[PDB]
Amino acid sequence: MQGVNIYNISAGTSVDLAAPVTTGDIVTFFSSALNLNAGAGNPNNTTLNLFAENGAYLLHIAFRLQENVIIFNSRQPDGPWLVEQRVSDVANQFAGIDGKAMVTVFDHGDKYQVVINEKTVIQYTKQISGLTSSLSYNATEETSIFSTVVEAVTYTGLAL
Amino acid sequence: MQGVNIYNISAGTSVDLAAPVTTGDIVTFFSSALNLNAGAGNPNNTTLNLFAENGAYLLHIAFRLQENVIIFNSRQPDGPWLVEQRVSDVANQFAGIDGKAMVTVFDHGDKYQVVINEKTVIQYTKQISGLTSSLSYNATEETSIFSTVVEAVTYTGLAL
């Protein structure tokens, strides 16, 4: 059946999903703030991650203000980061909405469609497949471009 | 491809969807407040609605604090209300989360699954079918159980 699950993710923590996210499902991260004047990341200001059951990063989204780019990649639990994808101009991706932001990830099976607000920023061809069993929002309170707590909501059972 | 559309609806207004909502799509309403002690509704404190192009109420969701019930119904343009469905105890449906609320409507084709936060409150068998082309949030800035402005997000193009 179709379900809605809400998770309040504090910066620097991960959460295990009650219902896994698979093909046809959706995960959205909501930030109650947009700090485009945050200091330099270390090197990341913020990262949003979808993990497989074995800890592999199915999708790693990293926002870097100083470098002015958004990075997308994957990695096996104890393996090296794979082929990195990049999109320039961070502020441009959030244009239109101030004081808050939303990042939606559609699991298309063969790809992860990432949407910032209403704009599709990348059609990420997967480097690692499988269902998403946990999520994380990593950043420090000093330099995150998002609120200290990001609300993740999953819409599952969509494909039936 | 799938899409995400964001709308900010002020109490007592409606918005026309850039991308209509059909079978397999999702509509979500986000409130940055939850006032379960709001004044007397007359008889409604808050209503969330899905309209067809012709003005039909595909889904009318009415929150009534004093009658302590959430009503669900439909009606044709210029027509009388159809068969009403009810869910008693408004506060209980929002139990678990304070200071905010989320209402999700899944268009399952034959029914509208309404979920308040994480709880499915009703599997509403449609009385009127068709595409949702308009949304509304009706209430006064004094007796609404939700914030002055409710953000509506639609996830479309999901089925095909």
UniProtKB/Swiss-Prot annotation, chains A, B:
N-acetyl-alpha-neuraminyl-(2->3)-beta-D-galactosyl-(1->4)-beta-D-glucose binds at N44, H60, R64, N73, R75, W81, E84. Homodimer. It is an enzyme of class 3 (hydrolase). This is Anti-tumor lectin. The modification Blocked amino end (Gln) is found at Q2. Residues 13-156 form the Galectin domain. Anti-tumor lectin with DNase activity. Inhibits the growth of several tumor cell lines in vitro. Induces lymphocyte infiltration and necrosis of tumor cells in a mouse tumor model. Induces apoptosis in HeLa cells. Binds N-acetylneuraminyl lactose (N-acetyl-alpha-neuraminyl-(2->3)-beta-D-galactosyl-(1->4)-beta-D-glucose). Its EC number is 3.1.21.-.
